[PDB]
């Protein structure tokens, strides 16, 4: 997690002023937790549920994470 | 007596880091001998920063370094800057003074 504070600075603020933060108007503090990458946990193969013939091989994978896709 | 760096929309607003302060030549200088323009800088809450004697130059520059250090630690005593500033000048020579021009801005 990281807390973020931002603020615009005009030409008045020099590098030292920017470091000191004195000449700038800090904004509100916003906190967010960085997401976690997807990790696979298990794999399996099953036959396709069918009435006749032989089902095609279907592979299952089980994962945990946050990735949208 | 004006600042040529003033923001387009607002005269009271200046955009640059240094005040591009410029004025006009006094029309009677030609008859007058050598002349010097005394420039006085006023801090907020009426305090006066410095009085600078300027001669032969009609456009004065107040470098950002002056605002940052010349008076942040001298008058205020702490690291900082001044935004609300008042500027005003006069035109005077030796063996006399011209207090009418002392009144400016």
From Swiss-Prot, chain A:
It is found in: Virion. Disulfide bonds: none annotated. Together with BHP-pb3, forms the central straight fiber, bearing the receptor binding protein RBP-pb5 at its C-terminus. Upon RBP-pb5 binding to the host receptor FhuA, the central fiber reorganizes and undergoes structural rearrangements that lead to its bending, bringing BHP-pb3 close to the host membrane for anchoring. Homotrimer. Interacts with baseplate hub protein pb3. Interacts with receptor-binding protein pb5. This is Straight fiber protein pb4. It comes from Escherichia phage T5. The gene is D17.
From Swiss-Prot, chain B:
Ubiquitinated by the Bil antiviral defense system when this protein is expressed in E.coli MG1655 strain expressing the Bil system. It is found in: Virion. Coiled coil: none annotated. Induction: Expressed in the late phase of the viral replicative cycle. It comes from the Viruses. Homotrimer. Forms a pseudo-hexameric ring. Interacts with distal tail protein pb9 and straight fiber protein pb4. Forms the simplified baseplate, together with the p132 collar protein, the baseplate tube protein p140 and distal tail protein pb9. Closes the tail tube and, upon infection, opens to form a channel thereby anchoring the tube to the outer membrane. These changes allow the tape measure protein pb2 to be expelled and phage DNA to be transferred to the host. Also forms the start of the central straight fiber, which is continued with the straight fiber protein pb4. This is Baseplate hub protein pb3. It comes from Escherichia phage T5. The chain holds residues 845 to 949 of 949 of the full protein.
